């Protein structure tokens, strides 16, 4: 996969690698799940998320 189309399937950041290799990454306050694309909050107040709505 390539980071320029569909974000390489990544939820957040994407790095191309020599080969058909691609690495997704997550912003500080998040961790990458085993699917290798999704990012999940590791802290109470991660960037870019709105707590009143995340609560609902």
């Amino acid at each position: 996969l390539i980071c320029v189309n569909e974000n390489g399937g990544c939820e957040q950041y994407c790095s191309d690698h020599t080969g058909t290799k691609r690495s997704c990454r997550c912003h500080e306050g998040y961790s990458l799940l085993a699917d290798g694309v999704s990012c999940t909050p590791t802290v109470e107040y991660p960037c870019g998320k709105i707590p009143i709505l995340e609560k609902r």
Binding site: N7, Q12, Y13, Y45, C47, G48, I50, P51
Partner: peptide
């Protein structure tokens, strides 16, 4: 009070 994410340039 919550920061907005400064994205990577490529992304």
């Amino acid at each position: 009070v919550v920061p907005l994410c400064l994205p990577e340039r490529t992304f």
